[PDB]
């Protein structure tokens, strides 16, 4: 789907993320909740976290962010060959915790924002475009897996 060069840009910036997955995850979740406050309602264990510092101090929130970025990293490393990784992720999102595709767009925006804020020299326009294509592919294929399970996303 993406060119080999586009995948290399995605995986180059992802290696920078892996220097501090927890901190990237916290900043991504905080940015998501600030930009799109409806998304915080999907996390009932976080409703008492009122400030950014409270969110950064919550080991629970940090672990949730690492779980999500670890799954995304493994998917991105498959360079589009990711059916076996998306099926269980679609199930985790489409049953009891219905996560709309729009919310995956919102977190994709937060991912782009945080990667650029932390790694501008490794995440210029071509790298941003490549990451956007990779996340668009992720969301398109998740949406198809949602539908197979009976969830229209
Ligand atoms: C890059 C995007 C995302 C990835 C890769 C991701 C990944 C994951 C993974 C791996 C799990 C663990 C499932 C399990 O262990 O069975 C999970 C659970 C969950 N995700 Fe996501 N997630 C993403 C985005 C979101 C968003 C945007 C929301 C809500 C706005 C969300 C809400 C949840 C909830 C509610 C759960 C289960 C309960 C919990 O962890 O508190 N996820 N996600």
Swiss-Prot record:
The modification Phosphothreonine is found at residue 67. Heme b binds at residue 93. It catalyses: Fe(III)-heme b-[protein] + nitric oxide + H2O = Fe(II)-heme b-[protein] + nitrite + 2 H(+); H2O2 + AH2 = A + 2 H2O. Its main location: cytoplasm. GO terms for biological process: removal of superoxide radicals. GO terms for molecular function: heme binding; metal ion binding; nitrite reductase activity; oxygen binding; oxygen carrier activity; peroxidase activity. It is an enzyme of class 1 (oxidoreductase). Its EC number is 1.7.-.-, 1.11.1.-. It comes from the Eukaryota. O2 binds at residue 64. It is found in: Cytoplasm, Sarcoplasm. The modification Phosphoserine is found at residue 3. Pfam families: Globin. Residues 1-147 form the Globin domain. InterPro entries: Globin, Globin-like_sf, Myoglobin. The keyword Kinase does not apply. SUPFAM superfamilies: Globin-like. The keyword rRNA-binding does not apply. Nitrite binds at residue 64. Keywords: Cytoplasm, Heme, Iron, Metal-binding, Muscle protein, Oxidoreductase, Oxygen transport, Phosphoprotein, Transport. One of its GO terms (cellular component) is extracellular exosome. Monomeric heme protein which primary function is to store oxygen and facilitate its diffusion within muscle tissues. Reversibly binds oxygen through a pentacoordinated heme iron and enables its timely and efficient release as needed during periods of heightened demand. Depending on the oxidative conditions of tissues and cells, and in addition to its ability to bind oxygen, it also has a nitrite reductase activity whereby it regulates the production of bioactive nitric oxide. Belongs to the globin family. Monomeric. PANTHER family: MYOGLOBIN (PTHR47132:SF1). This is Myoglobin. It comes from Physeter macrocephalus. The lineage of its organism: Eukaryota, Metazoa, Chordata, Craniata, Vertebrata. The gene is MB.
């Amino acid at each position: 789907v993406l060119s080999e060069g586009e995948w290399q840009l995605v995986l180059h910036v992802w290696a920078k993320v892996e220097a501090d997955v927890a901190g990237h995850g916290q900043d991504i979740l905080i940015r998501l909740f600030k930009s799109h406050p409806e998304t915080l309602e999907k996390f009932d264990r976080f409703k008492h976290l009122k400030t950014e510092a409270e969110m950064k101090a919550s080991e629970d929130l940090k672990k949730v962010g690492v779980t999500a970025l670890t799954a995304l990293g493994a998917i991105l490393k498959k360079k589009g060959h990711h059916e076996a990784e998306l099926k269980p992720l679609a199930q985790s999102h489409a049953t009891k915790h219905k996560i709309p595709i729009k919310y995956l767009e919102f977190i994709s925006e937060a991912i782009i924002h945080v990667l650029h804020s932390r790694h501008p020299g490794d995440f210029g326009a071509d790298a941003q475009g490549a990451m956007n294509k990779a996340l668009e592919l992720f969301r398109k294929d998740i949406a198809a897996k949602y539908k197979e399970l009976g969830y229209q996303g």
